Symmetry: C2
Subunit: 188 residues, 2 copies
């Protein structure tokens, strides 16, 4: 609403200054931001084929997935925040965020978030897998940068059984194969 | 193409580690990444109304706009790279990047880039304004964080006359008004 839109964009801009917590807790130097994370998710929504999904909706879901974190921060499992409490803080943040927009936009964005957070669609479940896959890609990238192959194994373990999209699964298996030989190599 | 898609995503992931040069050259501490920049552009494509534009195309344009920088880096005017040379390096990078994708995706992304870089559509000119507006928003955000109002005036000056979209113009004028009084305030 001019002033309001500006305020909205300043809130979203805070995502640039939310470091992704899972890396912080592992002492990764200069960790990616939450917006870095969503950026690569959105691109993945563009380039990972699934001709059953509204891709346009997938992209938007990716750009809204973690948007609430501009206010709540990036909660990691090590924060031990109960599921219900995380949901509450997130809902409260999206309502602040989206009500700076006019009704049509407020509605569209709030429901975008609602769909991803509820995982109430095929698109949403796809984008969820993008999130997880982007995360383990990023873990291998930090292992490489650190020259400590295998150091971030806990991220890979955390995603056991969470991948069911055919295209994402072979991407993940390619990654893991490459990484496993990088690990066996460095052991000699 | 499994291995290729992975390679594509690793290239795009490099955008996380390209600091935006205009801030580096002004000694901004912990400057945003190029993907941070595109992230907020894409959101702006979603929330700044223009019911003459394919918004879906605008979002994608925003996500591809600076993608070539994962290879060429983020060139600033202070680098003094001739227009033609910048174009060449960019084209060469997109061709590397997009040919890791299958034909339909290679084509779609290459032409997305081609459209923004050529500014050959209304959508492209809109997204260009998003880029510039996002940039000056970010300059005010760094001025605030630094408690040095006005320090990044050169960014504002650099955008004189570049805004013609009605919604973006009042956003920009709101910003500048707010900033100008922040500046007059601090002077007392
Ligand atoms: Mg998250
Ligand atoms: Mg999170
Ligand atoms: Mg997050
Ligand atoms: Mg979280
Ligand atoms: Mg998370
Ligand atoms: Mg640029
Ligand atoms: Mg640039
Ligand atoms: Mg750039
Ligand atoms: Mg540039
Ligand atoms: Mg630039």
């Amino acid at each position: 609403g001019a002033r309001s839109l500006l305020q909205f964009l300043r809130l979203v801009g805070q995502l640039k200054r939310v470091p992704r917590t899972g890396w912080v807790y592992r002492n990764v130097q200069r960790p990616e931001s939450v917006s870095d994370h969503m950026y690569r998710m959105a691109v993945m929504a563009m380039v990972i084929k699934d001709d059953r999904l509204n891709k346009d909706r997938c992209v938007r879901l990716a750009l809204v997935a973690d948007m609430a974190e501009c206010i709540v921060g990036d909660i990691a499992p090590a924060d031990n925040i109960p599921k219900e409490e995380k949901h509450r803080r997130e809902e409260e943040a999206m309502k602040q965020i989206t009500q700076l927009l006019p009704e049509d936009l407020r509605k569209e964005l709030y429901e975008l978030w609602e769909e991803y957070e509820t995982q109430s669609s095929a698109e949403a479940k796809f984008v969820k897998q993008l999130d997880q896959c982007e995360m383990i890609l990023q873990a291998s990238e930090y292992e490489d940068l650190e020259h400590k192959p295998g150091r971030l194994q806990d991220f890979y373990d955390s995603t056991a059984g969470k991948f069911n999209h055919p295209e994402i699964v072979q991407l993940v298996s390619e990654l893991e194969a490459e990484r496993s030989t990088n690990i066996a190599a460095a052991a000699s």
